[PDB]
Each structure stands twice: as structure tokens, then as C-alpha cells.
Amino acid sequence: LGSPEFMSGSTLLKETGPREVFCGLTSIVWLHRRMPDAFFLVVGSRTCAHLIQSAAGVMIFAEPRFGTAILEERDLAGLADAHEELDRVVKSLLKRRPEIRTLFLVGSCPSEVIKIDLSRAAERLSSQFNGQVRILNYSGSGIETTFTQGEDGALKALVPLMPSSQEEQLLLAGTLANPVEDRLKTIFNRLGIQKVESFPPRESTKLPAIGPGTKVLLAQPYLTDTARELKDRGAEILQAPFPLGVEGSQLWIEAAANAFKIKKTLVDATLEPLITRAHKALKPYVEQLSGKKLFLLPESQLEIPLARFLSNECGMKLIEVGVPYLNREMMGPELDLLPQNTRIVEGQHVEKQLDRVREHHPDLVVCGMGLANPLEAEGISTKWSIEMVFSPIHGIDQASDLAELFARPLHRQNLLN
Amino acid sequence: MELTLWTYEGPPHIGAMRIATSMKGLHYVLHAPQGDTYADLLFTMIERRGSRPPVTYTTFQARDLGGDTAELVKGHIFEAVERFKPEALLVGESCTAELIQDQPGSLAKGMGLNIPIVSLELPAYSKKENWGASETFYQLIRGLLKEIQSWQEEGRRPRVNLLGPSLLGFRCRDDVLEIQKILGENGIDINVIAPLGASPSDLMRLPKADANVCLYPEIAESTCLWLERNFKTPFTKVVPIGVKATQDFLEELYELLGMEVSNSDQSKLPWYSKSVDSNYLTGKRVFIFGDGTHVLAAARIANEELGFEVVGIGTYSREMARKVRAAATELGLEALITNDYLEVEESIKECAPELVLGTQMERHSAKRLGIPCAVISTPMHVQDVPARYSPQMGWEGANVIFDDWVHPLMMGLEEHLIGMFRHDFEFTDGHQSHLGHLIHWTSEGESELAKIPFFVRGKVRRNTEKYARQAGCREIDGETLLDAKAHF
Amino acid sequence: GALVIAVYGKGGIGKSTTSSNLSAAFSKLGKKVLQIGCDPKHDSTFTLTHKMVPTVIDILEEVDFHSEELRPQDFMFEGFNGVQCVESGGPPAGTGCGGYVTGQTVKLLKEHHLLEDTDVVIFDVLGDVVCGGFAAPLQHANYCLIVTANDFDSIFAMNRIVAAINAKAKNYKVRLGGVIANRSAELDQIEKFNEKTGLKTMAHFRNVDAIRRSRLKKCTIFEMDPEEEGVLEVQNEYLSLAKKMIDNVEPLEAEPLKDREIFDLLGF
Amino acid sequence: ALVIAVYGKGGIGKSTTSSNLSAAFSKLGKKVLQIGCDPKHDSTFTLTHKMVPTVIDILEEVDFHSEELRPQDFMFEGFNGVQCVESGGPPAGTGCGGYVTGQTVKLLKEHHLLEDTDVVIFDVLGDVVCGGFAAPLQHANYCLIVTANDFDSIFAMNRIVAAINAKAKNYKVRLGGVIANRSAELDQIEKFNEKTGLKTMAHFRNVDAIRRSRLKKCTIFEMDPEEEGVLEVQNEYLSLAKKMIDNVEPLEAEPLKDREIFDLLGF
Ligand code: PMR
Ligand SMILES: Nc1ncnc2c1ncn2[C@@H]1O[C@H](COP(=O)(O)OP(=O)(O)O)[C@@H](O)[C@H]1O
Ligand SMILES: Nc1ncnc2c1ncn2[C@@H]1O[C@H](COP(=O)(O)OP(=O)(O)O)[C@@H](O)[C@H]1O
Ligand code: SF4
Ligand code: SF4
Ligand SMILES: [K+]
Ligand SMILES: [Mg+2]
Ligand SMILES: [Mg+2]
């Protein structure tokens, strides 16, 4: 921990040391299901291969959806041409899965350290097919990306393939659950916004068009590069907090309505029943969560909006809000909503951070699954952090469900004892 | 490069981590990039442990590559020893760290630490998990004991070491329990169980045993060999999985100890398999795959204890290759020695078995091919680390094996009824209700093929086409399918 | 336009010396030029600035490696006659990964459009191209120039680099621009190699002590005393090379020789 | 076994010096093993008059199963009995030369090749851009640094000194001294030496017979004695070898900061 900085009444610290997070390769676990017509081929080692199947291999696959081109000794010794090897591997893969429409060559620590030019390989491979299979590249390496940053890489790679258009369009960027996607679209249509599309899409071949006149709402806080690339193609990136809970979702929706100049009386008549019902639904969880001390370890960059929601709407007390990365301009609107004197730590020293957890003994510690069960054995209740990336947590109507995710382990603690 | 949809083993450092975590008082400094800490979940989620693995990762980032990554690992070695105060220290690299070559192991030995240091040289691009664990286990013991009949004369019970069991091993938790129980009933004490549960101090007691029991050769064969050369300690080579195998194992250990005289009915498998409801199990076609030890064990059980016909067999353990080939030869088969999932899938598809006895990865191919499957070996996931007592070894292990290997098969009455009547609205073709879920062929030829009762239809189609090629037959018809049947 | 040149060659052959003076030559010819040092030693451009400017990873460290906060001209520094200077930097000797650092630096400079809005970009790469990271400039260059001496080990190194250029040419626009003879009185071995490979000599520098002295004085050859021995010939030669790259340069069809072939080729 | 690692600015004459030094040791009746740690694999050809197969190529022949290899498979006899090994490495701009070199050093250590001989010379490349090319340092007793009387080589030497000092914290390796090469005078070098604590162990001038010897694929000892400079250079190599046996001492040296050496050198 170094000298503190101060922004929006809140404290920003930075810590260096041992980290316990996922590399960006793990983005495949959710991305392969958002876009089933895509395949994710990692170029790396057996470690990378082992990572993905230790994650997703608990499920049984009739058809493979991901894989690893494992670097061999000859590759490292430069005795085999990397580009010839990639071509041969991609060749025999499309034999086993001839229905692949989009192939992602995902960079790893090994491929990025020795700098295999996967991007050019992707270009050349795309050329050799071009009517059938699109081949793209993004890095999911641990040395470069943390967890959800992998999605930022994947979406950024799709951006150049988005059709060019100057049409009216509200673009929702970031992985949404299917029913959440449909719900937000329905609401947006009630406001008079007829063109609402999602990025990423459900099919890799059907990318939304982009250009000037496209307003972009960022549903996920980890789309730094994707947002920048969307802006480079003419789209306007709306600034707003993230659609978590009533407060965040309301302002997020208002941002788009303001940009489309929708009359305030209409957006109020539309959002009012949703908000009132949400406040009603939230009550039993607030009862469970109010006054509870919360401590979040860095994982996904969801920690700041989650902390904002759990304190403002559920009445939890924040001990420490850890993030693996902090885009201050992007978290701007979110930092303004946070309660005063919030302690935010960018980076991590897991051992020292653990000491801070142990000395405080929080009511609920949001942490990874490398620390969850060990903390439980120490009599410290946890909420495994990964769940929020795999749950329908966005929108006014999902506020109570989001709160339930944190109320659940506390509730279970009571039931069992 | 090697296209790998599923890897049968992890990189070798996982094997090293398995040794350090299975033990106590042994810490592990791993030079690795940020993100390799996923390995912790293998122990906290799959093995469901309530403690962090004794592993300190340097977790370097890209920004660190522009700096002193060697100083980075030195600092973590200091911190780890100071904070955790272990009896001995493992120092090693991950695949990525192996590229930048910081020599972290030799560095550790030059830092003035006053505890034993094992410098691990694991080639992540040439070797795999089990080799990693065996190498780590070997070097640690070689390092601890390098500088350095009777039980009859002392007037004490014979005592053996149990070498091999480990976390992320297959049912090691209960195999140890079962074997320890059986040995005690045979009047044989346990000296040291390692690596699982052992400290470096315990490892010092390894020569004190009258014999070494090598339960998991993939992990402990190199060590038993080293212990034999240096301390004259003999070691068993029969792994006690299966009724007959457990009997042979008992007879073997008795010889090495010099005792005299294990009954068969101590397991319930012999009676269950002898009973009449197992009559229809005779000749059911099974494919077998996994690590060497469990494949060899399963092969004898399927062939000599259950009455299955092994139609395919293989292993990913290349160090076990010659033994699997010998076993395959007895079975009249050619052994599939590979780590290529697509080759395994293909081999299963080609011989079209009624049952697959493989790893977690074989569930993938069995699902696609619609074949009843059961897991007999690592790689595994959380389902195969159950709460209940679930050994594979000894008398009770054979009981578990009987239940689990027969379970995926359609049951007797239902299988007979589907062979009799094919026009049901609920009990259709390929339906198994006990799981609680709702070159050219002529039109004449395929009609006789649909008559074949499901799971054996695959082999029938193969044999008929092989028959039609084997003769001057062109097309195929209903009669040539019946001809093929009488031919084989 | 922009003309992107990558300078490779045997270690210590004089790649940094040549690149710096060549940049100075372009600037005197009116062109605006950026020079980029691709070496952990960051000793490429110091004769242009009379100073050792902070490196790319230095600027990144000040910003805690936050991309969104990064300022473009913060790692660029003005030198002789307006020449812009950038050093990639790298780890200390014997650790880290200079290859990743250099390669990632190149990509960082490409994405920020630094290889545009200037007339001449010159990549000055280290001697031992031990990995893909140090071949990164070849992914953007129009021409590669190889510096060599009139001896075995220099020419043998040039041959290995020629093979690298040909491999890169299969997927990128980069082509061989020619050979720069340096620290040599004659060219008999060089032109022998040129004859079989199809390479051409673009410039010839003798072993000049004023050049050695100029590096010690942290200045270009153009800032040395003209009346000092050899200074005039050297200055003219750098200008001639710059003019050749503006007016005459052509993609050379070249095939490297096998190790055993160049072994039997060179000698007496 | 006296283990020596040769480092220095690229193209300063590390391979030229090493091979001739190995020859000099052998003329003194010492058994010598020279190891080329460079993808160029151009360290020992003057000792063998040819390109010897590289360790990485030999490994590739046995599909990287190193246990099938013996010293006779990758070690070759050259001038006057000197044994030679080339690590080999990837083509320029491919793979990871550091990894490869790291693996080679380990194979040699496995076969006790750093023990069963009198003198061992690691000839390493110029750009020590990663740990793989610092791998010989764990086994070396001394490190010699080759430089010329000019800014860039001395500056490069300064970086290497900092690296040697670091490793010396945990390894037995020590600075053995400086080899002045390809220079008529020593003014800038001794300016650096006095302020760092290093000393010059040998001096070789710019001699064309030396350039010619690389082209003739032979050692300076096989050159014609009546050719200018040949005898002088032979005697300087003999002297340096004599020093490493009888006179060599671990030097206490501290490198300069970038700003310091920048201002120290010059006029
Ligand atoms: C009503 C008494 C009774 C019991 C306890 C069983 C158990 C059983 N009956 Mg069945 N069975 C009973 C009755 C009948 N069975 C019948 C038929 C039958 C068949 C074809 C089969 C079978 C079977 C069984 C079995 C073995 C478990 C199984 O695979 O279903 C039990 C425990 C099964 C087998 O393997 O028999 C040897 C098999 O193929 N039963 C019929 C024909 C009308 C009757 C009345
Ligand atoms: N034409 C030349 N004549 C004399 N000395 C030269 C010449 N070119 C280079 N040198 C010397 O070579 C040394 C190293 O040059 P440098 O640019 O560092 O090579 P590289 O960049 O290839 O390592 C310089 O200090 C300089 O004294
Ligand atoms: N003392 C010297 N006099 C003249 N030329 C030399 C001298 N030392 C080295 N050289 C020349 O320098 C070239 C580079 O030699 P080399 O051993 O490859 O250096 P390094 O191994 O440091 O790259 C040789 O081809 C040789 O011609
Ligand atoms: S990309 Fe890096 S951090 Fe991720 S699994 Fe591979 S080696 Fe580990
Ligand atoms: S050879 Fe290149 S890629 Fe490999 S560790 Fe060294 S600098 Fe990095
Ligand atoms: K393999
Ligand atoms: Mg240079
Ligand atoms: Mg050399």
C-alpha cells in the first residue's frame, strides 16, 4: 500500500504483490455459450489447456466448443514454422467441427511472451476461407488480462467486423443473460427507442452495425478497449453508472433516454411501476443485509458497482473494495454514487489482504474459489465472486435477485446453525 | 503444435503441487504468471479442502518482464519461508516461467536458508502431471535420505510403507483406508503413508519399514526403486484393485515379508457376478481407457471377474505402455497408446462398445456416441471425490466397482422387453428407465439392422459391412446381415 | 510514405551508430523522422539527444501501466535537427523478457499511430534476434537494411537475418533494401556473398576513428569537426544512403545460403 | 574444473577470444571444454574447422528424449584435443533462444560435463536479454568481459557487471577481469576500471590476422607465424591462459549508474 489518492470523497489505494485471480482465457467459459456458433482455440501450453477444462469440463460435451494448440519443443526451438503449424491445426479442427462459423485464436502467456503473431495468422486463415469461417484473435494471457478483461479482448476483435451504418441505434455492450437482454429491449422499446441491439450477439455471424448515430450503453465495467474501439468507428459512448440495482439501472436507462431526447414524463411513467415493485421485492433481503460488514477481493471490476448497490440499496457497510484494475474515467459516475470514505484498493497483495480480512472478520467476504472454502474453515462467511458473471443481475427488475446472491450464504449460515 | 480438445494430464507442476499439498510441513514456491493460481481450485473445490495449498506463486505480470523477475522470485522465497516456516522447500517453475529461465531453484539454494531445498527441474513442454509428481516425490526423498528378517528377530508385527496415494489421485482417500484395514486383519502394521499425510520428518522413517507397498506406480515406482537400491527395501508390484488382484497382492506381500498363509468371499463381487441376474452380463462389449494402473486393473476385472468382452483397450501413461500392450495381447487386441482425445474417441466409435470404462474425458465421447459410461480413472472432476466411502482397492473396492460399472447398463427385464417389442410409446429404443428420463445398404438390409436391439447394433453394422467386403458381396441386404451373424 | 526502415545486423556492427546518423541525414534532407530503439540497453538514440531519455516502460511505470491515461508524446523526445527519439527499454541483463518488452512496445507504437504523421520511421534493433519479439519491427517496415563488415561472423549473421526477412515476407510487405558495409576497408567477402544471394551494397563505411569518437562525444558525425580525419567522407556517405532510400531503393529478391554453403563460400 | 563464462558487447570478439583461449589452455596441457550458447552456433568452428551438430538438433533427433543421449552424441573433439559443444537455437526471430540455451546448460550439467575436465569455457552471446543466457553463471567460477576502447562496449560491459554482481549474491561466480580487444589503446577502459574496481587481464589490438583466422576457419595458432601479428596474438592468448591458472583473483567491483558512465566516458 502506497500513499493514498482521493476522488469523489472516496479513497483510492494501490497494492503490489502476489495475486489470486483468473487469466483472461477464462472468458471462454461464458463466451462459448453466449455465441454457440463460435469456437475458442487457445494457443499456449498444457497449463492453459488444463485451466479451461478444469473450469468447464465438469460439464459433458458431445461436441467440443474450445481447445488448445499446445506448443511443443520444436515450436520453442523454432524447428517448426509457427504459421505452418497453426494452419495445420486449424485445418484438422475444422474437420472435427465443420460447422464452426467463427474461430477465436486466443493468446496465452506462452504465445504472448515469445510473440507468435496470432493476429496475422488469423488474417491469413480468414483469407483462405472467407466465405465460411471467420478467424479472429484476442489475448487472454494472465500477464496481460485478468478474468473478465478477456471478454474486452474478444469484443474488441469483433468490432472491425461490425457493418458500417449511420442509423438510429442503441447498442448494449457487454454480456447480458438472454432474459435480461430481452427485458431491457422491451423497456427501451416502451420509451420509443425502436432500434436496440446487443454486443456480443447470440450468433457470431450476425454482428450489429455501427457508426455515427449509434449510442452505446456499457452494461459491463470491463470494456475499456472495446468502448475505445467502438468510439473510433463513430459511435457515441454514453457515460452512466452500471445497471446494477434500482439506482444504477435507473440512471443507466436515463442516460440513453436523455441522449435520444425522450420526454421525462414518459420515462417516469414507464420506470415507476418497475421501481416501486423492486423496492417491495428488495425488503426481505435488505433486512438480512443491512448493517452487515462487507469485504470484496479483486476479481472482475464488478466490485465497485456491487459495493455501491449493496451499501446504497441494501445498507451494507463496506470495509474494503478491491479491484484488479481501475479505469477512473469509466468508473466516474459510479464513484459519485459510492458512500463517502469508501476504501478502494487497486491491485493486491493476497497475503496482506488476507490479514486485513482476518483482522476485521467481515460478515461477508466476496472472494475467489481459491479462498472461499479455506475462509469458511476459519469461521468467515463468504460469497464466491465468480457467480455475478454467471447470474442475471442487470436491470431494475433484477435488483432483488442480485441482493439474494449475497443474502443466500448468510441465510444458509443460519439454516445450518 | 498439438491440437488438444481435452488433455488427459495437466502440466508437470500440478503433479508437484499434488505432492506438496498431500504432505504437511512442505511448502512450494512456484514461479508463474498471474492466473496460474487456478490450481488452488483443484484442491479447494474438487478436493473440497478447507485450507489453502502450501504454494506461493510469484504471479508476475507483463510489466514485470521489463524488470527483475529473478529478484521477484527471491523475495517470494524469503516471504514464504518466514511466514510459513516449513520443514522443507520445493522450488519450481510453471510453463511460462520456464521460458524466461530465472533458475529459481538454484537461486533458493544460494539464499542461506537452513532447511532442505528441492530444486525441481520439470520440463512443462515434454513431461506431464504424473511424471511431475513422481519426479518431485523422488527428488524429495532422494534429497532427504541420500547420506544414509528383522521383524521376526525383534518380536514385532511386520510394518509396511504405503507409497503412492495423493490428492487429485483417484479415490486415494478410501483406498488407503481399505488397504490399511486389510493389512491389519492380516497382521501387518503401517509404518509411513506417503505422500498423503506425511511430513518430511515422516519420510525420514521410510527405511524403517519391512517392505514398501506401491499402490500407485505412476506416482511412486521411481521412489520404491530408489528405496530398494539404497536401503534394500523390497516392494510389491501387484496393485490390489479387483478381487483376484487383491489376493495376488496379499500373496506377494506375504512372500516379501516371509509369512505363511485372503479368502475370495470377503468381497461381495464374486457372488453378485455369479448370481443369475449377472448372466446377461456375459459378453457385453467394453472399451477401457485411463492411466496404466487402473486400465490394467479394469482389464482383468472385466475379463476374469465380470465376464465382459474387452473390445478396446488403451492408456495415456506411456511409461506403462509395454504392460498395457502385453495385457492387450492376451485379450487379442492392439493397445491404444495415446494422449490424443480424438484418437480415443475414434477408437471407441470404431469398435462400438456397449460400455466405456474410461476417464472424465470418455464421458464426452460416450455422450456423443450414446454409450453407457463409467469413470475408472483420472482425469476426473468433483463427482468422483464423493463424501461416502468409495475405494477401488481391496474387498470393498470391488463392491463399489461392481455397483458402478454395472449401473450404466440397461437392466435385465427392460433389455429383454425392448428386444421383444419395439412399438411402445414410452419404452422406446435406447431408453433406460432406471435412469429416470423420458458399401450401400438396401431398404431391405437396413430393416434387418433396425431389428438389432440398440447398443449391439453398432457392432452388427460394422461386422456386416466387414463381411460384405470380405466376400464378393455388393450392396447389402437382410440375408447378408444374417449371413454375417452366422459368420462371426 | 511513411517509409519504415528496420535496421538489423551482427551484434556491435554499428547498427545504432548508423541509424542515428542516418536519421540525421534524412532530417538534413528535409524529411521528418522518428527513430525507435528496440534494445533493453536503450543506447540507440543518445547521440541524437546528447542524453539518455526515459524509456517506454519508464513512462508506463509513471502511469502505473494504465492505457487510458497514457500520453503519446511523453515517451517521444526531440533530438538533432528535430528528429524524434523513442527507446523501448527493457529488463536488466539476465532476467525478465526483453523480447516481449520490445514486441509489445512496437504494437503500442503502432496502435497510437506513431508510425504515421512522419516521413521516416527507423527501427534500430539489437544484434541477437533470439525470439519473435525482436522481429516485431519487421511486421511494419517497408524495407530492412542489414549492416555487416568484411569478415566471416558478420556476414554469417547477415545470412541468418536474410532468412528471417524472407520468412516475414511471406506474410508482410517488408523487403530487403540492401547491405550497409561498415568498419571495413574492402568488400571482397561481402560482394562474394552478395553475388550468390542477390543482395546489393547500398553504402560503404571504412573503419573511421572519428565515428568511434562521435559516440563518445554523444553527437552525430554531423556535429564533429569537419577538418578531423575522415569526417567528410562519412558525412557524405550517410547523406548518400539517405538519398538512396528516398530516390533509388528497390525490393531485392534474395535467397539465403545454408550454413554449410556460406561456410564453403567465405574464405580464401 | 575451472569454469569460465565469457560475456560482452555483441560482436566484440567473444567467440574469437574464447576459441583461441581454449586452444591456449590446451597448449598448456589442460583439458578443455568449450560451450557455445548462441542460436548462431558459431562459437567453436575455428576449433573444428566445421559446423558441429547442435544440442537442440541432436535432441530433436531423439524426439527430445534426453535420456537416450550420451556425451559422445553432442560433444566433438577439435584442435589439440579441445572438446566442443554448440547449444544451437531457433532461426532469427523465432521461438525462444533463452529457453533453448537454458535447456542445453542443464543437459550438460546432467552428464557431469562441467566436472570431468580441467577448464570449461561458456561462450555466450552479446545481448543477455533474459535469464536463459545467464544460465551459465550458476556453474561458473569466473566471468571474463570482453570490450573495446569505446563507449558502447564499455557501457554494455557495465550492464553485464551489474548482472554478475546480482548473481554473485547467491552463486560462487566472480568477476575475473576485463579482456581488452580490437583496440590500440586503453584510455576509456582504465577510466572505467579505476572507478569500478575491475582490472584488465589481457589486451588484443586490431589485428587483421585475427579477422583472417575466422575466415580460414582456424585458430590463431594455426596461422602462419610470419604473417603480421600472429606470434604476438598467440603469446597474448598464452599469457591470458597462464593468468587464469596462477594469477586470477575474484574482483570486488560495483557498476556505475547510467548517468555516471554516460558522463565518465568521453573527452
Ligand atoms: C414378483 C416377483 C419377482 C421379483 C422379486 C423379480 C426380480 C427380478 N427379476 Mg423378474 N422378478 C419377479 C417376477 C417376474 N420377473 C419376470 C421376468 C423377468 C425377466 C425377463 C428378467 C427378470 C429379471 C429380474 C431381476 C434382475 C434385475 C434386472 O436386471 O431386472 C430381479 C432382481 C432380469 C434378470 O436378470 O433375471 C435373472 C431379467 O432379465 N424378470 C416375470 C415374467 C412374467 C415375473 C412374474
Ligand atoms: N564505421 C565505423 N568506424 C569505426 N568504428 C565504428 C564504425 N561503426 C561503429 N563503430 C564502433 O562500433 C561501436 C558499436 O556501435 P553500435 O552502434 O553500438 O553497434 P550496434 O548498435 O550494432 O551494437 C561504436 O561504439 C563505434 O565506436
Ligand atoms: N583482435 C581483433 N582484431 C581484429 N578483428 C577482430 C579481433 N577480435 C575480433 N575481431 C573480428 O570481430 C568479428 C566478431 O567476432 P566474434 O567472435 O563473432 O564476436 P562475438 O562472439 O562477440 O560476436 C570476427 O569475425 C573478427 O573478424
Ligand atoms: S494464459 Fe498464462 S495464466 Fe492463463 S493458464 Fe495459460 S500460462 Fe496460466
Ligand atoms: S528468448 Fe526472447 S522470448 Fe524467450 S525469454 Fe528471452 S527475451 Fe523472452
Ligand atoms: K502430447
Ligand atoms: Mg545498437
Ligand atoms: Mg560469439
SS3 A287: helix
How many CB atoms lie under 10 A from the CB of residue B332?
Answer: 9
CB atoms within 10 A of CB A213: 14
| HEC-encoded secondary structure of chain C | CCEEEEEEECCCCCHHHHHHHHHHHHHHCCCCEEEEEECCCCCCCHHHHCCCCCCHHHHHHHCCCCHHHCCHHHCCEECHHHCEEEECCCCCCCCCEHHHHHHHHHHHHHHCCCCCCCCEEEEEECCCCCEHHHHHHHHCCCEEEEEECCCHHHHHHHHHHHHHHHHHHCCCCCEEEEEEECCCCCCHHHHHHHHHHCCCEEEECCCCHHHHHHHHCCCCHHHCCCCCCCHHHHHHHHHHHHHHHHHCCCCECCCCCCHHHHHHHCCC
Ligand 1 and B416: CB distance under 6 A:
yes
Task: Assess contact for A101 and A35: CB atoms under 8 A.
Answer: no
Domain that holds residue B173: 148-261
Q: Is C200 annotated as a binding residue?
A: no
Burial class (CB in 10 A: 0-12, 13-18, 19+), B436: exposed
Residues of B with CB under 8 A from a CB of C: 62-71, 99-100, 102
CA distance A333 to B134: 54
Structural domain containing residue A367: 1-22+285-417
- Mark whether B16 and B128 lie in a shared domain: yes
Report DSSP state, residue B87.
S
Instruction: Dump the DSSP string for chain D.
Output: -EEEEEEESTTSSHHHHHHHHHHHHHHTT--EEEEEESTT--SSHHHHSS-PPPHHHHHHHTTT-GGG--HHHH-EE-GGG-EEEE---PPTTSSBHHHHHHHHHHHHHHTTTTTSSSEEEEEE-S---BGGGSGGGGT-SEEEEEE-SSHHHHHHHHHHHHHHHHHTTTSS-EEEEEEEES-S--HHHHHHHHHHT--EEEEE---HHHHHHHHTTS-GGGS-TTSTTHHHHHHHHHHHHHHHHHT---B---PPPHHHHHHHS--
Residue with CA nearest ligand 1 atom 12: B413
Q: Counting atoms of ligand 4 from 1, which one is nearest the CA of B34?
A: 3
User: Which of A115, A327, A329 comes nearest C136 by C-beta?
Assistant: A115
Residues B287 and B429 reside in one and the same domain: yes
User: Which of B122, B147, B172 is the C-terminal boundary of a domain?
Assistant: B147
B187 in the same domain as B281: no
Specify the number of domains making up chain A.
3
Nearest to A256 by CA among A166, A179, A193, A173: A193
User: CB neighbours (10 Å) of residue A206?
Assistant: 12
Span between the terminal Cα atoms of chain C, in Å? 43
Distance, CA C11 to ligand 3 centroid (Å)?
A: 10
**Residue A272 CA to its chain's centroid (Å):** 29
Same domain assignment for residues B429 and B479: no
A309 class by beta-carbon count within 10 Å (0-12 exposed, 13-18 middle, 19+ buried): buried
Ligand 8 mean position, distance from CA D42 (Å): 6
Distance D255 CA to ligand 7 centre (A): 20
Q: Same domain for A184 and A155?
A: no
Looking at the structure, do residues A271 and A290 belong to the same domain, yes or no? no
CA distance B104 to chain C (A): 11
- Domain shared by B248 and B164, yes or no: yes
Task: Check CB contact under 8 Å for B2 and A70.
Answer: yes
Q: 3-state DSSP call for residue A136?
A: strand
Return the partners of chain C (3 or more C-beta pairs < 8 Å): A, B, D
> Which of B33, B40, B46 faces A143 most closely, judged by CB atoms?
B33
CA atoms of A282 and A284, how far apart (whole Å)? 6
d(CA C154, CA C148): 5
Are B83 and B184 members of one domain?
Answer: no
Q: How far apart are CA B350 and CA A140, in angstroms?
A: 37
Interface of D with B (CB under 8 A): 64, 96, 98-99, 101-103, 106, 130-132, 134-135, 138, 166, 169-171
- The CATH number covering residue A246 comes to 3.40.50.1980
Cβ B59–A19 below 8 Å, yes or no? yes
Of all residues in chain B, the one with the smallest CA distance to C93 is B68
Residue B320 grid cell: 506403462
Residue D167, annotated ligand binder?
A: no
Nearest to D131 among B102, B111, B126 (CB): B102
DSSP string, B321-335: HHHHHHHHHHTT---
CB atoms < 10 A from the CB of A7, how many? 15
If one counts the domains in chain D, the total is 1
Closest by Cα among D88, D8, D13, D18 to D47: D18
**C-alpha cell at position C253:** 529478391
Q: Hey, is the C-beta of D152 within 8 angstroms of any chain A C-beta?
A: no
The residue segments making up the domain with residue C241 are 1-268
Q: Which residue has the cell 448493517?
A: A291
Look up residue A23 and give its DSSP letter: B
Residue environment code for C13-52, b if the CB has 16+ CB neighbours within 10 A, otherwise e: bbbbbbbbbbbbbbbbeebebbbbbbbbbbbbbbbbbeeb
CA B465, B467, B473, B477: dihedral to nearest 10 degrees? -60
Instruction: Name every protein residue with a CB atom under 6 angstroms from any ligand 5 atom.
Output: A 113-114; B 99-100; C 97-100, 130-131, 133; D 96-99, 129-130, 132
The conformation of residue A316, written as its DSSP 8-state character, comes to P
Residues in chain D with CB shorter than 8 Å from the CB of C182 are: none
Q: Are residues A405 and A360 in the same domain?
A: yes
Chain C contact for D92 (CB, 8 A cutoff): yes
Say if residue B31 is in the same domain as residue B63: yes
Distance CA(A342)–CA(A337), nearest Å, equals 11
Cite the active site residues of C.
10, 15, 41, 128
Is B189 marked as binding a ligand? no
Residues with CB under 5 A from ligand 6 (ion): B 339
Say yes or no: B76 contacts chain A, CB-CB below 8 A.
Answer: yes
Among all chains, which residue has been given the C-alpha cell 495449498?
B53
> Where is the domain boundary, B92, B115, B147?
B147
- What method was applied to determine this entry? X-ray
What does the alpha-carbon distance between residue A296 and residue B155 come to, in Å, rounded to a whole number? 61
> Among partner residues D133, D151, D217, which is closest to C215 by beta-carbon distance?
D151
Amino acid letter, residue B28: Y
Q: From the candidates A21, A27, A47, A297, which should be mutated to test the interface with B, based on the most B CB atoms within 10 A? A: A47
- This PDB structure is determined at a resolution in Å of 2.1
Interface contact C185, partner D, CB < 8 A: no
The C-alpha atoms of residue B333 and residue B310 are separated, in whole angstroms, by: 8
Q: What is the largest CA-CA distance in chain B?
A: 83
Query: Contacts of residue A44 in chain B, CB cutoff 8 Å?
Result: 95
Same domain, A37 and A147: yes
List the CATH number of the domain containing C42: 3.40.50.300
CB contact under 8 A, B65 and C97: yes
Catalytic entry in B277, B403, B424, B429 = B277
Residues B413 and B304 in one domain: yes
Strands A66-70 and B2-4: antiparallel
Ligand 2 centre to CA of D261 (Å) is: 18
Residues B157 and B246 in one domain: yes
Contacts of D131 in chain B (CB under 8 A): 69-70, 100-103
Query: Which chain D residue has the Cα nearest residue B70?
Result: D131
Q: After which residues is chain B broken (C to N over 2.5 A)?
A: 148, 261, 438
Contact indicator for B9, B379 with CB cutoff of 8 Å: yes
Cβ neighbors of C153 (< 8 A, separation 6 or more) are C10, D11, D15, D16, D42, D214
**Residue D263 is among the residues annotated as catalytic for this protein:** no
Residue of B nearest to C55 (CA): B66
Strand order through the sheet with C143-148? C77-78, C84-87, C33-38, C120-125, C3-9, C143-148, C175-181, C201-204
Contact flag A76-D89 (C-beta cutoff 8 Å): no
Which residue owns the Cα nearest ligand 4 atom 6? A48
Q: Are residues A378 and A405 in the same domain?
A: yes
User: Which residues are near ligand 4 (CB < 6 Å)?
Assistant: A 23, 25, 44-45, 47-48, 51, 108-109, 141-142; B 33, 35-36, 95-96
Mutation test of ligand 1: which of B277, B411, B434 has the most ligand atoms closer than 8 Å to its C-beta?
Answer: B277
Helix, strand, coil % in chain B, rounded to nearest 5: 50, 10, 35
Closest to D121 measured CA to CA, from D196, D198, D61, D179: D179
Contact between B454 and B430 under an 8 Å Cβ cutoff? The reply is: yes
A16: number of Cβ within 10 Å: 12
A79: contact with D, CB 8 A cutoff = yes
> Residue A89 corresponds to which amino acid?
V
**Which residues 197-256 on chain A approach chain C with CB closer than 8 angstroms?**
224-225, 228
Q: Taking CB atoms and an 8 Å cutoff, what residues of chain B touch D96? A: 99
The C-alpha angle A267, A271, A275, rounded to 5 degrees, equals: 150
CA distance B471 to B484: 10
Kindly list the distances between the CA atom of residue B455 and the CA atoms of B108, B417, B443, C267, in Å, as whole numbers in the listed order: 58, 14, 21, 74
Query: Could you tell me which of D252, D258, D105, D112 has the C-alpha nearest to residue D168?
Result: D252
For residues B378 and B271, membership in a common domain is answered with: yes
Distance from CA of B189 to the nearest CA of A (A): 33
Classify residue B186 by its DSSP letter: T
List chain A residues with CB under 8 Å of B64: 143
Atom of ligand 1 nearest to the CA of B278: 35
B449 plus B483 within the same structural domain: yes
Whether D143 has a binding-site annotation, put simply, is no
CB nearest D99 (choices: B68, B70, B98): B98
Cross-strand bridge partners of residue B288: B313, B357
Determine whether the annotation assigns residue B412 to a binding site.
yes
Which residues 318-347 of B are in CB contact (within 8 Å) with A?
A: 342
